Amino acid sequence: GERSRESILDATERLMATKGYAATSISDIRDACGLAPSSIYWHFGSKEGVLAAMMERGAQRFFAAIPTWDEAHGPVEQRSERQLTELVSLQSQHPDFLRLFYLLSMERSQDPAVAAVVRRVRNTAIARFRDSITHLLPSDIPPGKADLVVAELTAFAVALSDGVYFAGHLEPDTTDVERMYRRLRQALEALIPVLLEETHHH
Amino acid sequence: GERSRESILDATERLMATKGYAATSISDIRDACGLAPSSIYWHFGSKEGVLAAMMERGAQRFFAAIPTWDEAHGPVEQRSERQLTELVSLQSQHPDFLRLFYLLSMERSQDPAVAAVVRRVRNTAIARFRDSITHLLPSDIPPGKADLVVAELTAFAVALSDGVYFAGHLEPDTTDVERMYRRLRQALEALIPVLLEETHHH
């Protein structure tokens, strides 16, 4: 049972918006929430552990929301447009959740528990792309080739999505997030016949 | 002057390999290079400034290893292919400077000099891609209709290029750098006529 876990996460979230990632140390957190570093090392095990938990907290709160009803809403193109705007809304609001993820992924992990948190959020994003991509393929594609194509398209879509964040971050004025995801869809649709053709070379 | 400055960057490069980005401090840098703190601030003026100079240095050796479109070997048709093979070869090495670039770009800095360095390295990458996208255009296309289309494809190429690094970092085993950059080439080639016919209306 942890009440203090919530107080620590809130304090560090304030320190992240102000001092930043590099300027935030364990002493700063200690001063903000009024807990000893050993007590902080108790709950999250590390300074990075707090960041991992903070980014994890943001994930389930933001990422996981209302994924399901797009299927029942309609079989039609409104599905992609639902997921598009859902992914756009996630991107266009520019949360510190996305910021914390890329911060931790690039950071060398001295706390192996942090990596496990990163992989959970990463695989979550991959699955969300894989789901919407499988429906972009025509239904007559054989199941064998359909798997390899989706896999390669997924990594492509995920890589594009990562660059969208940095584009909106480093070029806020000239970047249209919805338009870039529109181009992604057009790119994927064009890659399918090319991807199909390269699997026939067996 | 530049001699002592280079020694600091080398020592800082050592620390970034072994030690975390947030964990490393101006004190830790002193231990490695053996230089007094006040002598470090004279060259840079902050810890973040030291990391910025090292990243920019690593960035310049990266871009110098990649020939421009005119410098590229071979006939005019495959020039773009020769460029991509060098970018792939370097991305396959997974350079440490990029990891620091994405680290610094998301950082909110007290020092405006840091943001200026990140901006300069960012603009370089964009310009290098912009040059390549221009040469992918059909011969009969005038520079007039080009710019709006080129700028959009450039941002797309930059975005995916960012995601390639994150893919290789988070999925070292299942990620093929050459394959992903091949999909980029194929996507761009398909998107060129598409974006061109959209401006036929405009």
Side-chain angles (χ1 to χ4, degrees):
Chain A
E2 21 63 83
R3 203 275 90 180
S4 59
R5 239 187 59 104
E6 229 66 28
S7 63
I8 297 179
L9 296 181
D10 294 333
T12 60
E13 189 164 343
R14 282 176 171 261
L15 292 181
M16 274 298 165
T18 56
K19 303 192 63 178
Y21 175 73
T24 298
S25 65
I26 241 302
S27 296
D28 296 329
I29 302 173
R30 172 197 62 188
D31 299 337
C33 67
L35 274 72
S38 61
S39 300
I40 305 179
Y41 293 161
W42 178 250
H43 295 356
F44 314 96
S46 181
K47 184 187 83 69
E48 309 122 23
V50 186
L51 278 6
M54 233 180 71
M55 186 262 294
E56 183 73 87
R57 178 212 231 177
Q60 336 283 52
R61 186 170 300 172
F62 211 134
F63 211 148
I66 62 158
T68 168
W69 210 236
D70 47 20
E71 173 182 78
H73 166 47
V76 299
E77 81 100 28
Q78 253 60 39
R79 286 191 69 263
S80 61
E81 265 291 337
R82 180 64 217 94
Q83 214 292 109
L84 180 98
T85 55
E86 169 81 346
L87 189 55
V88 159
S89 178
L90 204 157
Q91 193 63 243
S92 295
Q93 294 173 205
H94 213 61
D96 301 318
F97 149 72
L98 287 182
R99 194 175 94 89
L100 209 49
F101 173 77
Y102 297 113
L103 246 322
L104 295 176
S105 62
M106 293 289 96
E107 185 70 57
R108 315 194 78 93
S109 300
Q110 29 209 340
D111 189 35
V114 176
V117 181
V118 173
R119 303 320 298 263
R120 281 191 290 267
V121 181
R122 179 63 164 185
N123 293 14
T124 301
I126 296 180
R128 294 287 273 267
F129 276 103
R130 181 183 295 109
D131 185 36
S132 60
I133 286 178
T134 49
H135 297 151
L136 268 185
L137 271 61
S139 58
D140 63 333
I141 302 302
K145 301 180 180 180
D147 288 329
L148 285 317
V149 167
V150 163
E152 190 171 354
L153 290 179
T154 300
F156 189 92
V158 169
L160 203 280
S161 183
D162 293 338
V164 168
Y165 168 81
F166 288 90
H169 191 75
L170 295 173
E171 293 91 25
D173 309 328
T174 62
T175 301
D176 193 332
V177 176
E178 175 195 305
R179 193 175 188 178
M180 290 187 61
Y181 280 115
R182 185 220 298 180
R183 301 305 183 186
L184 174 63
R185 178 180 177 86
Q186 292 174 320
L188 293 176
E189 293 171 354
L191 284 175
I192 298 172
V194 179
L195 230 46
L196 252 20
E197 193 253 22
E198 294 187 1
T199 59
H200 188 45
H201 291 145
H202 280 201
Chain B
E2 259 285 343
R3 306 151 180 176
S4 301
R5 183 127 45 183
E6 217 68 61
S7 61
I8 301 177
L9 298 178
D10 291 20
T12 309
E13 182 174 339
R14 264 250 234 88
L15 293 183
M16 291 303 296
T18 298
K19 304 178 182 179
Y21 162 74
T24 303
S25 61
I26 187 59
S27 179
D28 311 29
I29 302 182
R30 169 176 176 175
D31 293 284
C33 67
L35 264 64
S38 289
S39 57
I40 297 182
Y41 285 80
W42 286 338
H43 294 51
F44 307 108
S46 63
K47 165 199 164 182
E48 314 296 329
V50 182
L51 275 308
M54 196 263 293
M55 178 270 301
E56 182 174 31
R57 173 231 236 174
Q60 289 167 343
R61 278 107 75 106
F62 176 83
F63 287 109
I66 303 175
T68 63
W69 193 91
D70 303 274
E71 290 177 340
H73 297 141
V76 293
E77 309 92 48
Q78 23 208 11
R79 291 285 184 82
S80 305
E81 186 178 21
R82 304 289 187 271
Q83 264 189 325
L84 193 58
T85 56
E86 300 301 329
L87 177 56
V88 163
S89 180
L90 292 181
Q91 282 284 0
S92 295
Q93 297 173 349
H94 205 69
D96 193 33
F97 88 95
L98 280 174
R99 187 177 63 88
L100 184 54
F101 171 82
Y102 298 120
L103 241 27
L104 293 173
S105 64
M106 313 169 67
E107 185 71 55
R108 39 250 305 187
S109 59
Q110 135 208 45
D111 199 346
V114 175
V117 171
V118 175
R119 187 62 57 185
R120 176 165 57 255
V121 177
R122 181 63 168 183
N123 291 337
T124 293
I126 296 182
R128 296 293 294 273
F129 274 98
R130 191 182 192 93
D131 181 39
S132 295
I133 303 302
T134 300
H135 289 98
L136 261 51
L137 260 41
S139 298
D140 62 279
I141 299 299
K145 188 177 292 184
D147 289 29
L148 288 316
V149 179
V150 170
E152 188 167 359
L153 295 176
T154 299
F156 184 89
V158 169
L160 196 93
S161 184
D162 287 327
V164 169
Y165 187 84
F166 282 85
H169 192 90
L170 300 177
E171 294 88 32
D173 305 332
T174 56
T175 299
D176 194 342
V177 176
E178 179 181 353
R179 181 98 124 275
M180 291 186 61
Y181 273 114
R182 189 181 310 114
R183 303 311 167 191
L184 177 55
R185 174 206 279 103
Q186 293 167 328
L188 291 167
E189 291 168 356
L191 285 176
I192 289 177
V194 172
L195 270 64
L196 255 46
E197 309 312 311
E198 292 183 2
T199 59
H200 160 260
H201 306 341
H202 253 250

